[PDB]
Structures are given as structure tokens and as C-alpha cells.
Point group: D2
Chain length 280, copies 4
């Protein structure tokens, strides 16, 4: 059959829970940006598999509503804590409350981000600093505080930062996000090294476009990704099955990065008969 | 310092995927008779895959294939193959298609290695390694991919490289070279062969447990405070080859307890500095 | 001869100007951190080669001294402008003055930085933010503003960021620095792509230690780098000879990174005799 | 326009950059030294006073090139016929280089082969051919010279010319991508392993250099994927090469330098296809 048909058949999304039912029982997970999109799906999955989840972002209204919706769908309590990650104090309070309404985290997911798609020359210094403050410093502040607390309590945890495929390569039009996300990856590798003795491991997922256009033409897998597929990868990495996975960076992109980065991949349209002529 | 690594980095050596999730699937694994290849085969079979293993020592292949087959109640076929021979490779692919069917899961795991100063290697010692690792994976990939294209079928491919494939390393230079080539190939065919329903991923393992003072000094360079286990690696591989990972393609996953990040970080040697010593320096 | 002497003989530094005399004439160069160390060195050589340099940093005291010290050495004028790169207002005024006293820059070197060596546990959120600010945001503010000006003027420039080898790998004990430096690298790569249409190119050097014994055991070249060596590479990259080099990341480390990052490089101390033995067991 | 902005500011400086006679008394061994990039690198190193030795399969092209450069520079260029994928020829070639010129201070592994083809249409022999020339060839050359340098207690600067797709991989050039990546790994490995012997190892990753396209339009489309707005030149590359092999770079070791006009960063950045968007089009998306 055709490209699109092989792509649909052989890269069909398995959108159901992967890990053993109740595998996260007695584990507490903390998800920045847990109220929407990717953060939500990851919460929904960790909750649905038995974790006690704490979610944190700016908008309490959406945060409470998401927690409620998941809590009633899974049976397990999702707690909402209002937090702007770029504020150290709100972060300290959020860690303080996290440790009261659940206990010390076993799973830390840094997923809260901001982004502007714009020509860089149209960005103001403030627009730049904002993205940097949310992505880079916000992840640092959350990691710093939780880290400091886990050391004091002699507990360990699995940390997971969600970045993006352009974190590695750079990209025009998303410059402060590329820079801050690169910062986030370097931080993960830095702390995977530093904090092993404390029982803390640090991994990264770099997603391509998740369905939550014809970017599909740049994806070998011929479709956008799904939230549930991603959550599955996140759950695996934060699971005990992955206790030896540390300092890793996993592309979740249907092959988008390797495709666009390959010099001669712009030949993928070239037809069979054109190929016969080219070899002449 | 080690009881934190004992409890919080404790290995989970049981099967993670759901029972019979690999029913109806066929797995082909080079080096499937020993170490990691065996552990991977063991897991896939216990999850209901019809496994086919391939390497040179047929006696080990059959023993292993029989041992797993009796423990899981699913058939493990053995095929003798030197991966660096295209003709033997052709046969093997053919025999696999006849006795099991087109593979849904292809795992290149067969390797060879010298640990030696590079100046002590002959040209042939160098060429041998390149042959088994690079050309061998390529030959397996080429033929299988040609059959899958003809049959209008697709598969998940997986290559086991190493943490030094990305960095290079003295003393294992031909292996580093060939393995880097393998990673490049995977990323290349993730891009080229997506259209045929083929995806390609890579695991980079650190030291997996396969006077005893060398093991101790190695662990000193591992943040996770221990070597990996075959079972843990097997779960990562199954995941990567499972339908749960059908949007994972061109990925390169370090499975190393954090070794690469530790040794590569310029100031990581400062992990020896003591808490009281830091007080002296923080005053300066 | 032994290792140390082979290393001495074949890796000897060439600490003199490399490019043709007066090859940077008619060029203006802006260097942050250009008052001390690596930035000074790069300023000296560009000045010695005919560029009109403008250096910018916090401390006016050390800046003016340096800018005088170099101007007396080379003859060419080196201007100093007091600037904190984490302050976008001061950056805006600094760029404005740069253009008024020298003109639009042809070379832009983002070199100002700050660092702590510390267990990450002992960092306050404020200590972290400070490194992030000077390094990532500062470089972005300087780049943003000059870029905006160069686009307005329809002129182009070579940009150069000095990062470090751990920007790519991460590293414990220098964590905010690694994160910000990494951010600086992604930025260069992003802008090389975005701003090619405006005639701006973006490159990066990652230095290892530049002029202790512990490292030299981890440096295959067997010595620290020198400021004049690094300056030559900077000058090259900022010259018209490198007009087709864009988005590049050059390690200048005597091999330190490849040494430490290689799993089996810890076997470097294994002796010929032990090597004879090790092969007998395999 | 944009091309007038790029033409003015990324303008190629196609002339020697290193000081006259800076390579005097240095011997350089360049594989593929008779043609394309190898020729340009040979020409320049000779022009700067190096005793160059070039090597490749075709003695005729080799001799012609060697003579042509020797007459241009008054400096001696010797040809030695060599198939790099043949270990015994490599042995004899190195032995010949030592006798006719001396131990090399500069070694440039430039010889290559490539096929542009769908992978499915390659035979195992087509695949293996490329691996042999690019990976095994560079290795045999490096192995033998390095053995000789260690014996003699001399060091040298090694340079390997790869490609931007060696790090990323790329469809349609898969054997090359694989073999080139192996070459990069080798350079990094030997920078660590052989620094103690006075050997350093670096890599250039070139994008498209000026010398399939009957109309001229494919080259035109290629330029669109290049931030710098042109292809590179041999002379430019040769200058980067000479720099990396000069004593000025005696502290550069294990480096990998893209020379590509910014192509690799442009094609690899997820959102870079947004460069097509006009100013007005942006004036709507930001108004949302
Ligand atoms: N979806 C994709 O295709 C895609 C692609 C690549 C990468 N990603 C990555 O995936 C992650 C999740 O993104 P998404 O698509 O689900 O939605 P998103 O647009 O990134 O939403 C951001 C989330 O972070 C929270 N947030 C924003 N600012 C915050 C702050 N200052 N403090 C605390 N929380 C804050 C938001 O909640 P509040 O508004 O309540 O604060 C929101 O839930 C991000 O890291 C993103 O970079 C997504
Ligand atoms: N174990 C570790 O700590 C570790 C560390 C880093 C990387 N790895 C990687 O993990 C993979 C598995 O290796 P291992 O550790 O299980 O032990 P190993 O000794 O490397 O396994 C080699 C396997 O490959 C097969 N093989 C060798 N040459 C072959 C040839 N020419 N044709 C076909 N098959 C061939 C062998 O079977 P026959 O002898 O019967 O032919 C054997 O099963 C390797 O790719 C290795 O690079 C492992
Ligand atoms: N030296 C090495 O061995 C080495 C190794 C690896 C990387 N590097 C990199 O090389 C570069 C050069 O550093 P260096 O060794 O010469 O000294 P450094 O201490 O790393 O750089 C400090 C310089 O930057 C200026 N600076 C600091 N904060 C500033 C601010 N907020 N605004 C404006 N300027 C500021 C300082 O001047 P003021 O005090 O007046 O502000 C000083 O001139 C740095 O980017 C560093 O990251 C150096
Ligand atoms: N030109 C570009 O735009 C570009 C772009 C990316 C990368 N590169 C790289 O730059 C380098 C030079 O390339 P090029 O374009 O000048 O020509 P090329 O086609 O890449 O290389 C051909 C050269 O290699 C020699 N050679 C081929 N097979 C050989 C063998 N079996 N043993 C010894 N020598 C052999 C040839 O000499 P004989 O025919 O006499 O044997 C010829 O001089 C190559 O490594 C290439 O991969 C070039």
C-alpha cells in the first residue's frame, strides 16, 4: 500500500495504559503544568495507575477543575497547588504544601513552559526574560527546593523534564525557548551526575508535535503524536523499571528530528522513475 | 551514600509489559544466544513473541533456544549466521520468513570488541570489528528491509550500541567507530524508511552485569551506584520494540546508570571534595 | 622522549598574531568582559590587528585601565563603556554609544560571564538566577539589541560566544553556569539560522582551562591553553576568512573533553607491561 | 535584497590567510590530494612552503596535479598511488612517504566515495565499498602513520574531512553517513588515546562546496537552505584546513568544525521553515 497507509498501520497509536494496574500505588508525583495538555495526560495516567498526584501552575480555576475531573475518573486524589514556577517563594510554599498533603515526591515532572513564535528581532528583552524565567529558572527553582528537601529527608526521586527537539539543535523563531530548554537539558545531565549519591536520577523527553497542519510531511511516522503515547513514555521513565536510566534524553517525535536534520532527506519526494534516471 | 543507591535505584527484574502483549509478533535477534541478546529473547518470548535468534556458535544458540522455549511455551528458532557474510544473512532472513514470518521486531545486538592500545591492532583486527558491528548490522538491515518493502510490511528496529559510540574512546577505537556508524545508520533509516512502516531506535548501554576490585572502581563512576541488569535492559528494549512506542523513531537512549554524564562533566571529579572541605573553599 | 616531552614538543603554543598585519582595519569589534583575561586578550589582538575595539563590563576602573594599556601598546583606540549585561536599559544605551563613537560593529564577542564552583545544594535561588542573568540573558540582551540595530542599518556582523566544554555535557558543581552556557549555544545555533538573511553569522568556542596539576593529567595535549592561542581562533572566526563559517561550535581544550568523556580512557595509565599481561588473559 | 546583504557580508576571501612560508620544512600527506577539495588543500599547503605528498588510486590525475602545483609554487609535490582500502598498499605508501619526504607533520584523510541512492537499491557490496574507502581507509592510513610516528617519537596534526550528515545521519547517503560518523568517532578516540604521543586529531564537516544539475536550478534550491546564501569555496575550506594543521592550533584537539554556511543549523531547526513567512503575515499572527 501507499506511504500514508503503511504509516497508519505500522505506526498506529496505542493509547491505553501500558504499565501494570496499580504499579504506582504508594508513590507521590509532582507535575508542573499538570492542569492542561501534556501535564494533564501524564497526571491522568499516573493517577489512573495509583500515584498520589500534585499538580501546579498559575491558573487555579483550570487546575482545580482538572484535578476534580481526574480524581473522579480514577478514584485517586489529585491535589491542586497554585504556583508560578519563576517565583522562589511560591515554589518553596508549593514544595512545603506538597510535602504536607501527600508527602515527599517520588516523581518530579517539570513540564510548565511558555513560548512565543515570533521573529527574534520582534522580541523585547522582557519577552525573552519571561520565557527564560519560566522554563529555565522555574525548573531550576523547583529542582533546587525539592532536591534540598529530599536530601534532608534522605529520600530519592525520579526527575523528568519535558523539553523539545529544538533544545538540542536550536531553532529560529523560538529562540528564548530553545535557549532555556537547552539550559534545562544541561541541568538534567548536570544533576544526574551530581545527585546520584542522593538517590536522585534525571531524564529528559524531547517531544515533537503532539495532537492536543502539514508538519505531518516532516514526520516519518506520518501523523502527530498523542498525549497518551507520551504519558506512557513519561510513566516508564519515572517507574522503578527505569531505576538505572539516568542522564538520558529521549526523542519522542515520530522521527521528525532525524528527518529534517538529514542533508539529503529533501529527496524523500523523488519518485521511483526519477530514481531510475538519476542513477543514469 | 550507598544505602540511598541501594533502596532508590533498586532494580526491578520482572516483566513490565502486560502478559501476552507480544502474541502474534515475530522477533529476530542477532547475538540472541548470549548475554543481553538472551535476556531480550527471554523477555520477548515470555510475553508471547515467536523469537528467532542468530549467531555463529550453533551449539549455544540451540541450548539457549531450547531453554527459553521450555520456560515460556513459545517457540524460539535458532539459525546459524555470521552477520558479516551477506550470503549467510540472505539465507537467515529467508529461513526466518519461512519458519516464523516477516519480523515485526529486529534487534541488532551481535558485537565483537578488542580492548587494546590502538597501536597494537593489526589492520585485520580493525577490519574484523568494523565487519561484525557496522557492515553486519547493515547487511541484516538491508536484506530484512528489502523483504519488508516487497511484502508491504513494517517493523521496529533496535540497535544496541554503547555510551562510547557518541563520545569515542581510546582503547576501543574500532568498536567506537563501528558503533558510531551504527547509530548514524539508525537515524538515517528512521528518516528514509518511515514511509515503509519501519522505525529505528538505539540503546547505548553502560556496564551491565554479565580479585573483584575492577568492578568496585567502575561503580565509583556510576551515579546510580551499581551495574545494570540484563532484565532492566530487556524491559527498555521490549518497550522500544512494542506498539506503545510506535511514535518513537530515531531515538538514542542511554541506559548507563548515569555513567556518561558523570565522566563527561568537567568538574564532576569534585565529587570527592568533602562537606568540611567545601566550607574552607566557600570562605575564599 | 617521554609523554611530557612529546606533549611539550608537538603541542607548543604559538603565542604571536596569526592573521595578516592590519587585516582588521576598518572593522569595529564589541567585546563584553573585554577588560580582563580572555576578553582582554581577544581585544589586544584585534586592536593590534587594526580593529577599533569597544569593550564593555561593570567595573569602569579596570575597563579604562585596560583600554588605555592596550591603546598605548597597539596605537589603535580602544573605547570603554560601563555596562551590566543583565540590565537591558544599560545594554540599550551601551549599543547606542558603541555606534556613536565607533560605528556599527562588524565583530560582536559575547564573553562576559560569572561562575560559582559549589555543590548545587548550597546554591540559593538568587545565586542561580545571577549566573543565568549574566550569562544567558546578558548575551541575549546584547545580541537582541545589536541585531535589531544591524537589521535597521542593513549591515551584517560576525558574532562569537565564548562558552565552555561543559555547556554540551552538563557538569556537577557548575550547574547554573552549564545551563546558561548551553542556552547560549542553542541561541547561537538558532540565530545563525534565523539571521542569515540579515548578514549575521553566529559561532561558538568552548575553551577548556586557560592560564592545576591534577588538571593536566586529563588534557591529552599535556598543558593548559594560552590566551593568545584562544585569541587567534577568535580572530580567525571573526575574520572574512571565516565568512562561510556559521553555527559552528569549536572545542579549544587540548582534547580534555574527548579524554574525560571516553569510557575506557581511564586505561591511559596502564603500562606497556600490564598491556602485555592484559592481552594474555583475553 | 537579501542576496545583496549576504553577498556583501558573507563574501568569500579566496586567498592565503596564514603567513608566507609558515609551512616551510613541514611535510603534509593528503589522501585524495589530486582532485576537488584535496587539490585545493594541497595547493595551499604547498604555496605556504610545505613538502606535500598526495595519494589516491589514479596515478595519471595524481602526477598531473602534483606537477601542476610544483610548478605553481616551486615547492615539491610527490604523488604516490594508493588504494586506502588496501592495508598492504597503505603500508608501502607510508614507507614511501617517509623515504621521499619524511615523517608527516600533517595528515589529511580526505579520500572518499559516495552513492546517492535509496537504501533499498544498494547491494551489500555497494554498501561495503563505501565503508571500506571512507572508514577502513582512513583507519588504515591513520593506523600505519601513527605506528610510525610512535616508533620515531614524532607527533603530527591529523585532519579528517567528513560531512554535516555524519553527526545527524541522512537518508539516501546511508553508507557514507555511517562510515563518516565512524571516522568522527575515531578522531575523538585518538585525540584522547594518542595525545601522549604528540598526535592531535580534528574534523571538518563541510556542506556543499562549489565542485546531476543540468539546469542550474538544483544548486539554486540548495542555496535556499543555506543562511550564508552561497556554496562554499575550496580556498575557504583550505584555509580552515591549514589553520587546523598549523602550530597556531597546537591546542585544538578532538574538535569538530562545521564549515557549511549555516546549513546544518538551518535544516535541523524545527521551526526554521517559518523563514518563508512575510512581515505582514507575522503582523496578523501576533495580532491574535
Ligand atoms: N504539545 C506539543 O506538541 C509540544 C511540543 C513540544 C514540546 N512541548 C512541551 O510540553 C510541555 C507541556 O506543554 P503543553 O503543550 O501541554 O501546554 P503549554 O502551552 O506548554 O502549557 C504550559 C503549561 O505550563 C503551565 N505554566 C505556564 N507558565 C507557568 C508558570 N509561570 N508557573 C507554573 N506553571 C506555568 C500552564 O498552566 P497555567 O496557565 O495555569 O500557569 C500550562 O499548564 C511544555 O514543556 C512544552 O514545552 C509540547
Ligand atoms: N555487557 C555489557 O556491559 C555491555 C557494555 C557495552 C555495550 N554492550 C553491547 O551489548 C551487546 C551485547 O553484547 P554482550 O555484552 O551480550 O556480550 P558479547 O560477547 O558482546 O555478545 C556478542 C554476541 O554477538 C554474537 N556475535 C559475535 N560475532 C558475531 C558474528 N560475526 N556474527 C553473528 N553473531 C556474532 C555472539 O554470538 P556467537 O559467539 O555465537 O557468534 C554473541 O552472542 C553488544 O552489542 C555490546 O556492544 C554490552
Ligand atoms: N578562563 C578560563 O580558563 C575559561 C574556561 C572555560 C570558559 N571560559 C569562558 O571564557 C570567558 C572569559 O572569562 P575569563 O576567564 O576572562 O574571566 P571571567 O571571570 O569568566 O569573566 C568575567 C568578565 O566578565 C565581566 N562581567 C562579569 N559580570 C558582568 C556583568 N554582569 N555585565 C557585564 N560584564 C560582566 C567581568 O568584568 P566586570 O567585573 O567589570 O563586570 C570580567 O571582565 C567567560 O565567558 C568564561 O565563561 C573561560
Ligand atoms: N565537495 C563537497 O561539496 C563536499 C561536501 C561534503 C563532504 N565532502 C568531503 O570532502 C572530501 C573531498 O571530496 P571531493 O568532493 O574533493 O571528492 P570526493 O568524490 O569526495 O573524493 C574523491 C577523492 O578520493 C580519492 N579516492 C577515492 N577512492 C579512493 C580509494 N579507494 N583509495 C584512495 N583514494 C581514493 C579520489 O582519487 P582517485 O579517484 O585517484 O582514487 C578522489 O581524489 C571527501 O571526504 C568528501 O566526503 C565534500
Amino acid at each position: 500500500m501507499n506511504t500514508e497507509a503503511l504509516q497508519s498501520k505500522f505506526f498506529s497509536p496505542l493509547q491505553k495504559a501500558m504499565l501494570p494496574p496499580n504499579s504506582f500505588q504508594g508513590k507521590v508525583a509532582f507535575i508542573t503544568g499538570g492542569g492542561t495538555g501534556l501535564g494533564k495526560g501524564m497526571t491522568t495516567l499516573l493517577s489512573s495507575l495509583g500515584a498520589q498526584c500534585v499538580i501546579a501552575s498559575r491558573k487555579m480555576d483550570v487546575l482545580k477543575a482538572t484535578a476534580e475531573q481526574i480524581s473522579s475518573q480514577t478514584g485517586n486524589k489529585v491535589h491542586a497547588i497554585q504556583c508560578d514556577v519563576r517565583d522562589p517563594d511560591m515554589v518553596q510554599n508549593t514544595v512545603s504544601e506538597l510535602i504536607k498533603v501527600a508527602g515527599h515526591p517520588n516523581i518530579v515532572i517539570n513540564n510548565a513552559a511558555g513560548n512565543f513564535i515570533s521573529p527574534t528581532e520582534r522580541l523585547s528583552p522582557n519577552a525573552w526574560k519571561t520565557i527564560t524565567d519560566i522554563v529555565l529558572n522555574g525548573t531550576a527553582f523547583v529542582t533546587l527546593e525539592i532536591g534540598k528537601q529530599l536530601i534532608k529527608a534522605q529520600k530519592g526521586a525520579a526527575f523528568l523534564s519535558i523539553t523539545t527537539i529544538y533544545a538540542e539543535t536550536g531553532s529560529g523563531f523560538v529562540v528564548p525557548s530553545a535557549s532555556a530548554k537547552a539550559g534545562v537539558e544541561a541541568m538534567s545531565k548536570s544533576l544526574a551526575a551530581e545527585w546520584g549519591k542522593y538517590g536522585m536520577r534525571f531524564n529528559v523527553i524531547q517531544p515533537g508535535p503532539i495532537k492536543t497542519k502539514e508538519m505531518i510531511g516532516r514526520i516519518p511516522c506520518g501523523r502527530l503524536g498523542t498525549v497518551e503515547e507520551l504519558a506512557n513514555l513519561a510513566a516508564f521513565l519515572c517507574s522503578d523499571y527505569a531505576s538505572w536510566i539516568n542522564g538520558a534524553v529521549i526523542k519522542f517525535d515520530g522521527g521528525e528530528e532525524v528527518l529534517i536534520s538529514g542533508e539529503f532527506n529533501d529527496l524523500r519526494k523523488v519518485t521511483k522513475e526519477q530514481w531510475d534516471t538519476i542513477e543514469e
